[PDB]
Amino acid sequence: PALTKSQTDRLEVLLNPKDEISLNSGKPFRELESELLSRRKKDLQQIYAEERENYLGKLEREITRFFVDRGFLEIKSPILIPLEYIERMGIDNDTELSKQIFRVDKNFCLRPMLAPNLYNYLRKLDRALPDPIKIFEIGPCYRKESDGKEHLEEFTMLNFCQMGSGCTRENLESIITDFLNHLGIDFKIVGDSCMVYGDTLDVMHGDLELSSAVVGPIPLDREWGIDKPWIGAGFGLERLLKVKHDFKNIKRAARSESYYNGISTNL
Numbered sequence: 653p654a655l656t657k658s659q660t661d662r663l664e665v666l667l668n669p670k671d672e673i674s675l676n677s678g679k680p681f682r683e684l685e686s687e688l689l690s691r692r693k694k695d696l697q698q699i700y701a702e703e704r705e706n707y708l709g710k711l712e713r714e715i716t717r718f719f720v721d722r723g724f725l726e727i728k729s730p731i732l733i734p735l736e737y738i739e740r741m742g743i744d745n746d747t748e749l750s751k752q753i754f755r756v757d758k759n760f761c762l763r764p765m766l767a768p769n770l771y772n773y774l775r776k777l778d779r780a781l782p783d784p785i786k787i788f789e790i791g792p793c794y795r796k797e798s799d800g801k802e803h804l805e806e807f808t809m810l811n812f813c814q815m816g817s818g819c820t821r822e823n824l825e826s827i828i829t830d831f832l833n834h835l836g837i838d839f840k841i842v843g844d845s846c847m848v849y850g851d852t853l854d855v856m857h858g859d860l861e862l863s864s865a866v867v868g869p870i871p872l873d874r875e876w877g878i879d880k881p882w883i884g885a886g887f888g889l890e891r892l893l894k895v896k897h898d899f900k901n902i903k904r905a906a907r908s909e910s911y912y913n914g915i916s917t918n919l
């Protein structure tokens with residue numbers, strides 16, 4: 653008797669990318685399930701006995717070390733931010749990204765991106781730090797989404813940026829290139845052909861967007877008291893993990909009660 657679709661869904665929760673076993677080979681569901689539960693328990697036992705690190709926390713520490721070693725100051729800014737920051741980001745109440753925002757009181761929301769706090773740090777630190785100013789933040793962001801294959805409602809962003817001298821497209825591409833080759837993630841940078849000043853580049857892994865990146869200046873800068881050249885990029889940590897570990901579903905890389913380091917916790 654063939655596996656039912658529900659049975660197949662159950663086994664896939666338990667399946668790992670490198671398991672390499674035939675789901676079409678005559679063996680009953682109960683035995684296939686029992687073999688996989690056994691392997692997944694072994695995986696959790698190995699982690700507990702040896703490393704004990706969460707993939708998301710560990711990616712965060714590896715990324716932090718990378719950017720600190722290259723001259724970028726580590727920022728930890730509020731996750732709960734004023735709603736006014738969203739409007740000041742040019743997201744008017746008509747825009748679709750405006751529908752994706754988790755509001756908290758009359759006045760606050762969960763940040764859907766790192767840019768507003770980074771803009772404020774850029775302006776402030778410009779009164780104290782020598783040119784160029786190099787900063788980054790890693791942390792949670794929130795968007796109400798309409799999909800769930802590559803999009804989470806709760807995700808983790810890395811954003812880095814540089815302001816002042818050296819803010820070129822070539823330098824932006826070089827830092828992105830060094831970063832992803834350090835992590836061992838394959839990519840290609842796509843952008844408009846002959847664009848110089850206000851460019852937007854996407855960093856792609858096949859059809860999956862890893863990052864969008866910007867070469868400033870852009871008109872929105874003046875709303876934040878910024879009047880210097882800059883470069884920057886934002887990367888989703890869960891998309892990076894999904895590519896690195898070859899997860900079929902991004903939920904396996906998220907903050908979760910259902911998966912730990914890509915392994916089902918429902919054993």
Ligand SMILES: CCCC(=O)NCCCC[C@@H](N)C(=O)OP(=O)(O)OC[C@H]1O[C@@H](n2cnc3c(N)ncnc32)[C@H](O)[C@@H]1O
Pocket residue numbers: 764765766767768770771774795797802803804805807809811812813861862863864865866883884885886887888889890891
């Ligand atoms: C002052 C300095 C500002 C600065 O430095 N600006 C340039 C940075 C632009 C970036 C910034 N402005 C930005 O938001 O873009 P995004 O909405 O395309 O998200 C970027 C990445 O986050 C991930 N991502 C986005 N939404 C999701 C989601 N629902 N689930 C998982 N990952 C996601 C995904 O990897 C995506 O490519």
Ligand SMILES: [Mg+2]
Pocket residue numbers: 864
């Ligand atoms: Mg985008």
